[PDB]
From a paper:
[name] is a compact [name]-associated nuclease from functionally diverse type V [name]-Cas effectors and recognizes a purine-rich protospacer adjacent motif ([name]) distinct from that of other type V Cas effectors. Secondly, as a member of subtype V-H, [name] is distinguished by its relatively small size (870 amino acids), functioning as a compact DNA endonuclease guided by a single [name] with proficient DNA cleavage capability, highlighting its potential as an efficient genome editing tool. [name] preferentially nicks the nontarget strand (NTS) of target [name] and indiscriminately cleaves ssDNA by collateral cleavage in the RuvC domain. Displaying a “Crab Claw” shape, [name] contains a distinguishable recognition (REC) lobe and a nuclease (NUC) lobe, with the two lobes connected by the WED domain.
To investigate how [name] is activated after target recognition, we reconstituted the second ternary complex, which consists of the [name] [name] mutant, [name], and target DNA in the absence of Mg2+; this complex is hereafter referred as the R-loop formation complex (Cas12h1D465A-[name]-[name]). We determined the cryo-EM structure of the [name] R-loop formation complex at an average resolution of 2.76 Å. Superimposition of the structures shows [name] undergoes substantial conformational rearrangements from surveillance state to R-loop formation. A comparison of the conformational changes in the lid motif revealed that in the surveillance state, the lid motif was mostly highly flexible (662–670 aa invisible); then, the [name]:TS heteroduplex helps turn up the lid motif and stabilize the lid in an “open” conformation where the catalytic site is exposed; finally, the NTS turned inwards and was loaded to the catalytic site for cleavage. After target recognition, the lid motif forms new hydrogen bonds with the heteroduplex (S666-A(10), K675-dT(-9), K675-dG(-8)), together with other new hydrogen bonds between D667-Y302, L676-R634, and L660-R680, which stabilize and keep the lid motif in an “open” conformation. The NTS moves ~18 Å towards the catalytic site for first strand cleavage. Moreover, the [name] and the TS DNA form a 20 bp heteroduplex in the R-loop formation state, in contrast to the 17 bp heteroduplex in the interference state, indicating that the TS has partially disassociated with the [name] and been loaded into the catalytic site for second strand cleavage.
Author numbering: 1 to 764, 777 to 809, 815 to 870
RNA sequence: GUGCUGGCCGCUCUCGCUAGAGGGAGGUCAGAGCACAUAAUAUCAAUGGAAUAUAG
DNA sequence: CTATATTCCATTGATATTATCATCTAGAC
DNA sequence: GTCTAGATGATAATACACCGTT
């Protein structure tokens, strides 16, 4: 049920409601946000005061000292009630008895099916099997095993069941009822059952959302403390006291400062260096210990200091949740409320029995929707339709394939603009075949024979690249057990291409016009900044700045009129690329990402242009504009790219992707450029689109997947001038390939080999992905390494903490790796002509890249 | 059904003027293809701006 | 004027939790 | 019989990695 089904959802807006529906909704919301606070104040939770931004906090002890006054003699009961609702599951089905007045318990337990199959064969089942079955089940654990055996032996199954039922009844199932009598709890509809069932099931979700976050945070604030407490070194203390003195003189320490200071401390400068305080402080003999310290220890001393600094900025406890925002009310078909759905020609009717009907519109996401009632579910058939809002259109209306799903619940929610929405969570049906093949086999470096014997006899596989430019570069293939071809797949056999590497979509002609329009904005920003900082000293503009300002025609010839005209020029030149690239419905995806950065820099330009008139020494707080037009144009660009990848690999079983890394901390200098691509959400939007069609997906390591030879496994040099070319030097000959195709082919190659073959590692090799490699190729997982010859190595059973590479099948040293790149470079500036080779042509015999067998 | 777009006109805020640029709200003319898993809570990092030290 | 660095304020990228029922059972007609 | 609501349901699974070199 919830194993081989894909849960998706969508919403229909409720056009009109009749009956007591609004009273039903608002009572539920108000009772939820009241009893959530009441339950939060029972289970003593520590929390930080929102008033002072967590400067002070409420301890977990005064919460107990206050619950004692708030609750009274009922501490024992409430503790059990909270635990039962926190653990959840099946046993928490009868907790709605706290809000219901007409609740009726059952002194006899329900005769479940498992009880049935436990009853037919109790007599013919020996004593050693009367302990394992019952040690887990709590209900059955109320009777000793020997009593079970004797009862089964000398009684009739009916008279075992009739006798044994009263004891196995859970006693704490009326706990929520008895608490209501003890405290006199009054909800708003005490004589209704669906209301109570909905209310308790919604309150429990919001409390179990905070319980797991609380207990996780209070543990996460301990591992960092331990990690700092372990990494104590001399370099750590040196860096810490250096940071302390720089903070005494309000400088502070950064990684760039920690390397420039070290290097420039030894030498002497003439012009004032960007950093002077730090280098001067390094001049002192106090900080001479770290000058001879190894780099590996220095990194562990700096990272430990950064981690210790982050921990000092932690609140004692998480904030208290904000219950004010409305929840999403669920109503089902078996007990948890009730509804009937029946599709008409022009409307969809939802009938809440005593709470009135709801009339809903049709959508193009549920086109041609038909619903047939079944015993405890619905059957849906709908086709996605093209949403042509233009009355007269010039595009042919497209339809989609039939989709079948089972619907069993609906949701109602109220948006802040007072519009109710009906949500239909529907589950699609697909095989669990290839998801298991992807997750179980293609990802694990050491799959077991249990799955290996069950691998299919044929497959289709693919690969792709994701970059800011040339977004998708795919390659198709076909592997097959008992088949011969160039590609090699570990533990499975061989393979062969069916569609050679290429570029799915080249970047459009408008993608180069949008990259200079951002330089214009950045330079006009700095120009305006200098145009403001200069007036403080009453100086004069630089000639080059004025000449730059001159070209755009201004009404006057004032400099501050030139910038004011250029700001208008850029606005009028960006608004031309919105209406003109929207008219086409955002056709080319590559050029629709540069426009996003155009917008982003334009907002900062205006943000700094609205403050050009200020005076020194004051402060200018922002103003909170209300907009969501930048989070709704970015959420379309990560869906279109996901759909484009899926539609191409529609006749494939598995697709291989590299695991890109998201934006990082302040040390990295390119956080503002990987936030445009947003790789980690793009890889999440791709996965859902693939999963909707029963296709697996594997993420392989990206280390060095763009600087090898797909054929021979040798290293290559990437031209800095031209970023779409990579050069190789083999057999005293110079070869040329394409850069992105090399990435796609290497992604496929490490996909088929489970990426178990390494690219670069630094000897202490502690890793399920390299340990198996050492055994499979060299012979032992535990081996020592000693350098020899001209830069090769000889694996034996010394060097510690060194960066060893791998090219051509033999490990090398870092110096040799640099020198091969240098010789390729030295030869390429000698203008030696090279011949291009293709990865899609035939007559290639093997693919040794990232292969190690 | 949700989402994403500009031309143009008065009103009203912000700044400056040898001169105009930006924000909010409204009216009107057009354009309009292609994607859609929908929500509640909590935590971390940074981006952008402003000011302040500074040294040199 | 170009770097390093401190405080304030939205706003964004990213990842964790909570969810997307089934099967007796007693009463009316 | 056939609906139609209210009160109660064994366990119930799947990968891997950070340690220089701009």
């Amino acid at each position: 049920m919830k194993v081989h089904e894909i849960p998706r959802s969508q919403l229909l807006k409720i056009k009109q409601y009749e009956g007591s529906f609004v009273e039903w909704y608002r009572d539920l919301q108000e009772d939820r946000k009241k009893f959530a606070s009441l339950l939060f104040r029972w289970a003593a939770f520590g929390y930080a005061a929102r008033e002072d931004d967590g400067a002070t906090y409420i301890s977990p002890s005064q919460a107990l000292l206050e619950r004692r006054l708030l609750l009274g003699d009922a501490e024992d009961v409430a503790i059990k009630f909270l635990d039962v609702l926190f653990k959840g599951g099946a046993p928490s089905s009868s907790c709605y008895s706290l809000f219901y007045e007409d609740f009726a318990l059952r002194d006899k337990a329900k005769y479940s099916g498992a009880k049935r199959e436990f009853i037919e064969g109790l007599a013919t089942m020996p004593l050693d099997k009367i302990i394992e079955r019952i040690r887990q089940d709590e209900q059955l654990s109320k009777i000793p095993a020997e009593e079970w055996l004797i009862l089964g032996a000398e009684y009739s199954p009916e008279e075992i069941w009739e006798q044994v039922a009263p004891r196995i009844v859970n006693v704490d199932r009326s706990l929520g009822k008895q608490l209501r009598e003890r405290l006199g709890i009054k909800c708003r509809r005490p004589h209704d059952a669906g209301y109570c069932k909905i209310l308790m099931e919604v309150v429990a979700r919001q409390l179990r959302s905070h319980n797991e976050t609380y207990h996780e945070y209070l543990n996460q604030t301990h591992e960092m403390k331990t990690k700092v407490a372990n990494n104590l070194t001399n370099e750590f203390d040196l860096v810490c006291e250096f940071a302390e003195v720089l903070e005494e003189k309000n400088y502070g320490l950064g990684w760039y400062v920690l390397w420039q200071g070290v290097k420039q401390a030894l030498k002497e400068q003439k012009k004032p260096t960007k950093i002077q305080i730090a280098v001067d402080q390094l001049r002192q003999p106090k900080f001479a210990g770290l000058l001879t310290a190894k780099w590996r220890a220095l990194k562990g001393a700096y990272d430990t200091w950064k981690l210790k600094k982050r921990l000092e900025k932690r609140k004692a406890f998480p904030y208290m949740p904000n219950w004010d925002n409305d929840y999403q009310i669920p109503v089902g078909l078996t007990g948890l409320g009730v509804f009937t759905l029946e599709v008409k020609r022009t409307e969809v009717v939802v009938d809440l029995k005593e709470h009135g009907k709801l009339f809903c519109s049709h959508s193009h996401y549920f086109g041609d929707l038909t619903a047939e009632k079944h015993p405890s579910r619905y059957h849906l058939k709908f086709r996605h339709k093209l949403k042509l809002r233009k009355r007269d259109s010039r595009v042919e209306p497209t339809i989609g394939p039939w989709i079948e799903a089972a619907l069993r619940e609906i949701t109602i929610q109220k948006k802040p603009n007072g519009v109710f929405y009906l949500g239909l969570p529907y589950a699609l049906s697909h095989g669990i075949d290839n998801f298991q093949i992807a997750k179980r086999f293609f990802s694990a470096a050491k799959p077991d024979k249990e799955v290996i014997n069950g691998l299919p006899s044929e497959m289709v596989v693919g690969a792709a690249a994701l970059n800011l430019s040339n977004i998708v570069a795919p390659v198709k293939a076909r592997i097959g057990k008992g088949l011969e071809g160039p590609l090699h797949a570990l533990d499975y056999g061989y393979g062969e291409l069916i569609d050679g590497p290429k570029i799915l979509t080249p970047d459009g002609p408008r993608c180069g016009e949008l990259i200079s329009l951002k330089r214009d904005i950045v330079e006009i920003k700095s120009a305006i900044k200098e145009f403001k900082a200069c007036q403080r000293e009453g100086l004069t503009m630089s000639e080059e700045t004025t000449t730059w300002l001159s070209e755009v025609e201004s009404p006057s010839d004032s400099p501050r009129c030139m910038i004011q005209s250029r700001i208008a020029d850029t606005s009028r030149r960006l608004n031309s690329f919105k209406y003109q690239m929207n008219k086409e419905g955002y056709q080319d995806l590559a050029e629709a990402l540069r426009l996003l950065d155009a917008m982003d820099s334009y907002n900062s330009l205006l943000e700094s242009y609205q403050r050009m008139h200020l005076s020194p020494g004051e402060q200018s707080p922002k103003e909170a504009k209300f907009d969501t037009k930048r989070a709704s144009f970015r959420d379309l660009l990560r869906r279109r790219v996901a759909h484009t990848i899926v539609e191409y690999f529609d006749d494939c079983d598995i697709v291989f992707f590299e695991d890109l890394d998201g934006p990082s901390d302040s040390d990295s200098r390119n956080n503002a450029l990987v936030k445009l691509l947003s790789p980690r959400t793009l890889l999440l939007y791709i996965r859902q689109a693939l999963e909707k069609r029963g296709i697996g997906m594997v993420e392989v390591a990206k280390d060095g997947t763009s600087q090898n030879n797909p054929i021979s496994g040798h290293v290559g040099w990437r031209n800095k001038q031209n970023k779409s070319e990579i050069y190789f030097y083999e057999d005293k000959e110079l070869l040329v390939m394409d850069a992105d195709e090399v990435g796609a082919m290497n992604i496929l190659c490490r996909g088929l080999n489970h990426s178990v073959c390494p690219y670069s590692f630094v000897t202490k090799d502690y890793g399920k992905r390299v340990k198996r490699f050492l055994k499979d190729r060299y012979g032992s997982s535990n081996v020592r390494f000693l350098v020899a010859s001209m830069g090769f190595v000889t694996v034996t059973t010394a060097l510690v903490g060194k960066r060893l590479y791998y090219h051509g099948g033999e490990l090398v040293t870092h110096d040799l790796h640099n020198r091969m790149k240098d010789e390729i470079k030295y030869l390429v500036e000698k203008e030696v002509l090279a011949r291009r080779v293709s990865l899609s042509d035939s007559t290639i015999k093997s693919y040794k890249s990232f292969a190690h067998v």
